[PDB]
Structure formats: structure tokens, C-alpha cells
PDB file of C-alpha atoms in Angstrom:
ATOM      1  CA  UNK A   1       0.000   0.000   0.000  1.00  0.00           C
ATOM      2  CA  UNK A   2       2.846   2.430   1.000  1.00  0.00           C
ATOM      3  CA  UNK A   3       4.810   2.149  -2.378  1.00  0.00           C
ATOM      4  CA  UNK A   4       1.550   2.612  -4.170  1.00  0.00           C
ATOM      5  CA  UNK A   5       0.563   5.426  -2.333  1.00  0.00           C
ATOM      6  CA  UNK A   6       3.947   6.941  -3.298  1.00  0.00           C
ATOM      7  CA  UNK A   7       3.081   6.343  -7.124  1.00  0.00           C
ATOM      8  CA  UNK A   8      -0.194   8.302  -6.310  1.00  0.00           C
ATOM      9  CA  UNK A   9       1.914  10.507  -4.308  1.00  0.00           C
ATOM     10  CA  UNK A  10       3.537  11.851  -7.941  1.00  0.00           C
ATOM     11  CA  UNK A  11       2.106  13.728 -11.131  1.00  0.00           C
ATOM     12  CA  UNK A  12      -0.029  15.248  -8.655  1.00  0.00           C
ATOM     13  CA  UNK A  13       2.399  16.308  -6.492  1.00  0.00           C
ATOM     14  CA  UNK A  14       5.136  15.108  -7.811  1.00  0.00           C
ATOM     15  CA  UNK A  15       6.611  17.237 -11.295  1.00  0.00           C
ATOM     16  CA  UNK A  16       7.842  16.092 -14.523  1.00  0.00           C
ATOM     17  CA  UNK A  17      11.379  17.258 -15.998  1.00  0.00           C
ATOM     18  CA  UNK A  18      10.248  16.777 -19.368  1.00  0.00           C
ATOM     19  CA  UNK A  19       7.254  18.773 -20.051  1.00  0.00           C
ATOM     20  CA  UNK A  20       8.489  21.161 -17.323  1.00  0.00           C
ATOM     21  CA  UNK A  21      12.248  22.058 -18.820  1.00  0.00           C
ATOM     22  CA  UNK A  22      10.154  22.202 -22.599  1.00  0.00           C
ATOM     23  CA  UNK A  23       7.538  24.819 -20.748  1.00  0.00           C
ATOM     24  CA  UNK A  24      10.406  26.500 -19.355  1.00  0.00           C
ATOM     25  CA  UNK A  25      12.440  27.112 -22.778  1.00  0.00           C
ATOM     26  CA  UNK A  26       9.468  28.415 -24.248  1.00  0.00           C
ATOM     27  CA  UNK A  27       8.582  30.775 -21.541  1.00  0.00           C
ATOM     28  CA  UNK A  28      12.656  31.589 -22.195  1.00  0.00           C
ATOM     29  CA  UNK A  29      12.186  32.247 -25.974  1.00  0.00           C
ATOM     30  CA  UNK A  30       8.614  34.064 -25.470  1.00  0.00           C
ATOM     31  CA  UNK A  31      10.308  36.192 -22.741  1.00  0.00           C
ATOM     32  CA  UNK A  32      13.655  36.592 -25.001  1.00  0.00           C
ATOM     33  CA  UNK A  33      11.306  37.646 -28.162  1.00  0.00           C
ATOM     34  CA  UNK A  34       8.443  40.276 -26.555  1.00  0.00           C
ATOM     35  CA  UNK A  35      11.783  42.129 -24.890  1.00  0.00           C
ATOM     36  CA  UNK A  36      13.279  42.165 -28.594  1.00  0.00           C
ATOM     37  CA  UNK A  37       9.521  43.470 -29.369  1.00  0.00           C
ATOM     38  CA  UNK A  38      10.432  46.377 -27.204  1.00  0.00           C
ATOM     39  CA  UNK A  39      13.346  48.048 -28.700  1.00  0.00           C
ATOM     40  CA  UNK A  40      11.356  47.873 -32.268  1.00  0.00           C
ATOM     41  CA  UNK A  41       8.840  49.727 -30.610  1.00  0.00           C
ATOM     42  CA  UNK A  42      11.092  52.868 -29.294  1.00  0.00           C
ATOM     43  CA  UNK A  43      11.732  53.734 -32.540  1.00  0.00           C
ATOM     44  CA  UNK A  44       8.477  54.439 -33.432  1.00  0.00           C
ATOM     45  CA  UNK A  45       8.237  57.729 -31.465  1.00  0.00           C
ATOM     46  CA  UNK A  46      11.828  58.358 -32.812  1.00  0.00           C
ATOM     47  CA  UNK A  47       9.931  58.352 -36.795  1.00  0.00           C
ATOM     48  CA  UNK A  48       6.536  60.219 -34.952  1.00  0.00           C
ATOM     49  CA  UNK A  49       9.311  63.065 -34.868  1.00  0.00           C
ATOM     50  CA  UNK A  50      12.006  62.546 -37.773  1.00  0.00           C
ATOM     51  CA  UNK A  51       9.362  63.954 -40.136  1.00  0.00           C
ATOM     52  CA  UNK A  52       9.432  67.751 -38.384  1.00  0.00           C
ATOM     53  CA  UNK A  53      13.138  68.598 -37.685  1.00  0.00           C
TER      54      UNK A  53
ATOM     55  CA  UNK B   1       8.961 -47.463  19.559  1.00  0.00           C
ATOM     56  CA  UNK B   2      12.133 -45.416  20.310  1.00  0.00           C
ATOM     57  CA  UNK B   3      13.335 -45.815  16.963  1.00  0.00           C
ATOM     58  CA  UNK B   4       9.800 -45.172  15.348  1.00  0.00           C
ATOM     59  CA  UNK B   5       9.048 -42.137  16.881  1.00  0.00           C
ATOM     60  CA  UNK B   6      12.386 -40.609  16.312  1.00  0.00           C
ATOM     61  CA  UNK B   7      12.053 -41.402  12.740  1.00  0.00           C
ATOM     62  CA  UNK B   8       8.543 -39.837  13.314  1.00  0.00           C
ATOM     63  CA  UNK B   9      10.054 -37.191  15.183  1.00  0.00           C
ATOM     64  CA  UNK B  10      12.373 -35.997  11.713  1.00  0.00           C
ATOM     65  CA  UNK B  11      10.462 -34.324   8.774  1.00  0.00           C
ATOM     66  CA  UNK B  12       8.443 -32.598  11.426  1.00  0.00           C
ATOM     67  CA  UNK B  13      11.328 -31.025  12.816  1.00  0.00           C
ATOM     68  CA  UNK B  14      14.664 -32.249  11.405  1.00  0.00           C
ATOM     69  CA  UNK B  15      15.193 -30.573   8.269  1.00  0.00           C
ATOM     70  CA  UNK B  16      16.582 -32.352   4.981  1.00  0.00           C
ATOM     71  CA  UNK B  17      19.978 -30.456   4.142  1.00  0.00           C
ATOM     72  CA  UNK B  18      19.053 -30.565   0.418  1.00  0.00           C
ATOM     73  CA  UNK B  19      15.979 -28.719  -0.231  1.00  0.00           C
ATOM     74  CA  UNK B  20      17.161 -26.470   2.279  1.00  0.00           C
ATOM     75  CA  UNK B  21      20.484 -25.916   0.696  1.00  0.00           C
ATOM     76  CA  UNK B  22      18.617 -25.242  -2.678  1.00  0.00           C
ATOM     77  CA  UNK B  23      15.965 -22.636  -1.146  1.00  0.00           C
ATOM     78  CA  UNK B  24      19.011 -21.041   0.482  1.00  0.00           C
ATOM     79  CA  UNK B  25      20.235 -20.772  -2.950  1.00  0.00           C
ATOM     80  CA  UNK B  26      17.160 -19.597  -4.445  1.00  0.00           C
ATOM     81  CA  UNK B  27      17.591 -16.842  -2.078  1.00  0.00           C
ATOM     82  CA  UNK B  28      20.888 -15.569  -2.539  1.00  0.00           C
ATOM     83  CA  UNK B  29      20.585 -15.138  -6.329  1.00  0.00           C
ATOM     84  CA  UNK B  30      17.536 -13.365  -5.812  1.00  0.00           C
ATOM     85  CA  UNK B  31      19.205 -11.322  -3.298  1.00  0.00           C
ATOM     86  CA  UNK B  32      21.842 -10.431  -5.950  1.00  0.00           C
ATOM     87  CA  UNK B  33      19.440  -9.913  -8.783  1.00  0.00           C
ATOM     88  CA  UNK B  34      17.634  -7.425  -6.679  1.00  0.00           C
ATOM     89  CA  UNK B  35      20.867  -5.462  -5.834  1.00  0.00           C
ATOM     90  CA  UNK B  36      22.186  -5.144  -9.286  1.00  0.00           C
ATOM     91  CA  UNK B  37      18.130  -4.041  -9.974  1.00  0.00           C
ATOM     92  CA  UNK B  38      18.977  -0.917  -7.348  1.00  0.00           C
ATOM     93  CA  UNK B  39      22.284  -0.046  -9.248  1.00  0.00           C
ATOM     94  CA  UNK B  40      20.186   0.526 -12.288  1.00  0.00           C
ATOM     95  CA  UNK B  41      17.456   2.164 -10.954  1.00  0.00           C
ATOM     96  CA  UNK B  42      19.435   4.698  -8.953  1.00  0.00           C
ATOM     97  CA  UNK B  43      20.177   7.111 -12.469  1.00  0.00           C
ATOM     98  CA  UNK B  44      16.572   6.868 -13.414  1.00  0.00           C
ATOM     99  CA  UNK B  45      16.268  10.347 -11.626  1.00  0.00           C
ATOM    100  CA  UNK B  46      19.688  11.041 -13.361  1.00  0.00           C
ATOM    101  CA  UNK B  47      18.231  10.649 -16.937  1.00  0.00           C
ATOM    102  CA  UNK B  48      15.556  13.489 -15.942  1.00  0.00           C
ATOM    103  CA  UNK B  49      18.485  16.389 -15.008  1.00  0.00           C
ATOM    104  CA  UNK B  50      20.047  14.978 -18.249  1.00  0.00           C
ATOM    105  CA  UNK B  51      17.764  16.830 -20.168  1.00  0.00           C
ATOM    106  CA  UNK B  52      18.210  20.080 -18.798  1.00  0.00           C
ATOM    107  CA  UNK B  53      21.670  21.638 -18.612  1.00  0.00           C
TER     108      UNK B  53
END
């Protein structure tokens, strides 16, 4: 019963390296990109003045 | 009725030195196999941190 219980005691408690780490490197990439997002949107009020010196 | 009853009085409590000899045996491998089965189940945690650096 007690080595059962510790198979029930895991993927509910317990967490998983493989779907975690692949969550994790995507969060890294999604993180990585939307910052990159950010310093092609500065410019934009840098053009919203080029055009009157 | 000396010699009966000591006859009688083996098998019910003297033990034959060859099927004991064999489950004794029986044991000991099983006892190995088992301890070799730990060895290889120890890095099955190690393969999960494998996959992340």
C-alpha cells in the first residue's frame, strides 16, 4: 500500500522534468522575443518626430 | 517405539539439508538480482536532469 501510495503521491504532487524544462524554454524564448519586441517599438516615437526637424 | 518415533520425530522437525540448501540458494541469487536491480534504478532520476543543462 505504501509504495503505491507513493506512485499516487507523484504527477499530482510530484513534477515532470520533461514537459516542465520544454515549458520552461518556451517561456525563455517568449520572454527573449516580446523584450526584442520592445526596442522595435522605441523607434516608433523616434519616426513620430524625424518627419518635423 | 524409540526408533519409530524418532524417525517420526524428523520431517516434522529435522530438516533435509538438500531442499534447504537449494531454497538457500534460491535466495541468494535473488538477493543479488535485486541489488544489481537498485544499481540501475538509482540514475533513473539522473536521466531526468540529463535533459536540462
Amino acid at each position: 500500500i505504501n509504495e503505491n501510495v507513493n506512485a499516487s503521491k507523484s504527477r499530482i504532487k510530484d513534477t515532470d522534468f520533461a514537459k516542465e524544462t520544454t515549458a520552461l524554454t518556451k517561456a525563455q524564448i517568449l520572454s527573449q522575443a516580446s523584450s526584442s519586441v520592445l526596442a522595435q517599438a522605441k523607434q516608433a516615437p523616434n519616426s513620430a518626430l524625424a518627419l518635423l526637424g
